[PDB]
Amino acid sequence: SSQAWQPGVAMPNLYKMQRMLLEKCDLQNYGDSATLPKGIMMNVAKYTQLCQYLNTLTLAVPYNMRVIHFGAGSDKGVAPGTAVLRQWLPTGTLLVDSDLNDFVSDADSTLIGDCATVHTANKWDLIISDMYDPKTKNVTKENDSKEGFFTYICGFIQQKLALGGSVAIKITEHSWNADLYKLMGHFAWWTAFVTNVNASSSEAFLIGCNYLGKPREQIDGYVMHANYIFWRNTNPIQLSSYSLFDMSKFPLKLRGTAVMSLKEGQINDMILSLLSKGRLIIRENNRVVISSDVLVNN
Amino acid sequence: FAVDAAKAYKDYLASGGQPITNCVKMLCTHTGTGQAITVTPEANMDQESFGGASCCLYCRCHIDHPNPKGFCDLKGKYVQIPTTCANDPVGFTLKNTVCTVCGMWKGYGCSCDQL
Ligand SMILES: C[S@@+](CC[C@H](N)C(=O)[O-])C[C@H]1O[C@@H](n2cnc3c(N)ncnc32)[C@H](O)[C@@H]1O
Ligand SMILES: [Zn+2]
Ligand SMILES: [Zn+2]
């Protein structure tokens, strides 16, 4: 297959249409590793292939684009994904990132603390989340839909994502949420994308492409996670670093997508059509103001 | 009194100490302008491009950037490092200076002192 030369593999549509039961995820390539280029961290390669895949979708890319990055820190104290996003997004793009623990970043602003404490006045054109809590991978207990930061994410998407904006939210076999799968039905398109560098993991990015603010199709999150696990169980993906060696077309093209501040009665079917095609962002174009709530105690 | 961390890191290195790790190296074509501090990776055949924040000693050590106003040259940018020095990008950025005429490192790309 050409798949080894792609940045990763996206869930095929026929799998999205099934009604599988949730099964334990057992990957044939489990334990294999991709040969990363010399000196390259796994998360730089992972974010790179994520952005290479995003280059194939109809993302709205306005002027003064607004991107927020949750789960941006690491145990290294640095933010590799934020650096890749910085490299990928057009110059002048506002990049805010956040994490629970402190880290040093290249983002324009960084908030430290639980994501539940993060509040912003404005809306966003692109949301990226790599938030993950290792305590969720418990093979000895039932794999229920998880809440925690996922709850925040769903709220944050419905209140603070611009119409036509896009999201990419990291999930695993156990780090997932049913309402997030349901929310994917409020986008013009959605997928689960697996990077070729990390194809031995149940990890994928839930990508919602072009937010519509209302359900387009009805998605059962439990069934859809079952479908994703069935896909990953039955389609071994070949680990590959190949796409990392061609960075010649990596930058996100600055499309100058129109931004309009419309009220809700104004969103006719033609506006919906423009949103669906990556040609319109609906949000106010004011100042970007963010904050992190601080709990005081003794 | 003022903590002088650049000096302490230079002496730490001279004492045979292990350089600061986890500087974030980027993927790039390595056909860039080779300038020192850029808004996107600009490594040439002879450089690696790193995220600036991870290569600044003050950012990495959680201490004040040494200037009034406290601004940081590297954070939010990308720093090109000669591949022969990529083992220690923080030490390199500390030990060297950028030409203000051409954007290149003095002694590592700058040729403004040529005939
Ligand atoms: C896989 S690491 C992300 C690594 C990072 N994206 C990188 O570039 O290397 C997952 C991160 O999510 C963060 N996290 C988990 N739960 C969180 C929460 N509820 N609020 C904020 N951050 C959270 C953890 O602190 C951890 O740093
Ligand atoms: Zn700094
Ligand atoms: Zn010069």
Author numbering:
A (entry chain A): 1 to 298
B (entry chain B): 19 to 133
Q: Could you give the paper's own sentences about this structure?
A:
In addition, the electron densities for the SAM molecule were clearly observed in both structures, demonstrating that the protein had captured SAM simultaneously when expressed in E. coli. It is also notable that the stoichiometry calculated with the protein purified directly from E. coli were ~0.35 for SAM and ~0.3 for SIN, indicating that about 2/3 of the SAM-binding pockets were pre-occupied during expression. Within nsp16, an SAM-binding pocket is constituted by amino acids N43, Y47, G71, G81, D99, N101, C115, and D130.
Among these, nsp10 and nsp16 form a protein complex, which functions to catalyze the methylation of the penultimate nucleotide of the viral RNA cap at the ribose 2′-O position. Such methylation process would convert the RNA cap of the virus from a cap-0 structure (featured as 7MeGpppA…) into a cap-1 structure (featured as 7MeGpppA2′-O-Me…) to mimic cellular mRNAs and thereby to prevent recognition of viral RNAs by host innate immunity.
